[PDB]
Amino acid sequence: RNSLDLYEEILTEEGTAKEATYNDLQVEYGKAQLQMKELMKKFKEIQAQNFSLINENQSLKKNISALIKTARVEINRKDEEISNLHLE
Amino acid sequence: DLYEEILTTAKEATYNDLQVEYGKAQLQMKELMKKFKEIQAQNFSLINENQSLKKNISALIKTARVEINRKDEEISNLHLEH
């Protein structure tokens, strides 16, 4: 019966192994999901950061364009009056 | 009949199922890291650019204020010698 005795010991030895490989997979899966959750929370942060950065960036581009134009016009009104005084 | 039980099975199919799930999770994670580093890079670019614009605006106001006042002095002096 030692061929059957070995057969039964074999079935359980392979069963113990496959269940422990499965167990390992279940654990590594959950670990990975924890990892994901953390990175997702970090990602949402820099994305919101990214959102306000672009907003600030657009407004600054607006402002520095507007201030240039209002300045160049304000200096032209000067140069025009100077010419008129040079013309009187 | 020996090994027919262990060969024939849902124990190993559900292992495969989860193994596929675990693989997908990893790839989803690798894709997320990619997007993260991409968005992060933009922020470093935006932070850099924004701070230099604020400085540029400041420098702009200063030289504008100076040149305008200078023209204004020219105008005063013109009336005076007139």
Author numbering:
A (entry chain B): 52 to 139
B (entry chain A): 56 to 63, 67 to 140
What does the publication say?
To rule out the possibility that the observed FLASH NTD dimer is a crystallographic artifact caused by oxidized cysteine residues, we determined the structures of the FLASH NTD C54S/C83A double mutant in two different crystal forms at 2.1 and 2.6 Å resolution, respectively. In addition to Cys83, we also mutated the other Cys residue in the FLASH NTD, Cys54, in case it formed a disulfide as well even though the residue was disordered in the structure. The two structures adopt the same coiled-coil dimer as the wild-type FLASH NTD, confirming that FLASH NTD dimer formation does not require the Cys83 disulfide. The individual protomers of these two mutant dimers also show differences, similar to those observed for the wild-type dimer. Interestingly, residues 53–70 from one of the protomers in the structure at 2.6 Å resolution are stabilized by crystal packing, showing strong electron density corresponding to an α-helix. This protomer appears to form a single long α-helix from residues 53 to 137. The other protomer showed weak electron density for residues 56–62, while residues 51–55 and 63–66 are not observed. It appears that the helix for residues 53–70 does not dimerize, and it may also be structurally independent of residues 71–137, even though a single long helix (residues 53–137) is observed in one crystal form. The LDLY motif (residues 55–58) essential for binding the HCC is situated in the N-terminal helix. Whether the flexibility of this helix is a feature needed for binding the HCC will need to await further investigation.
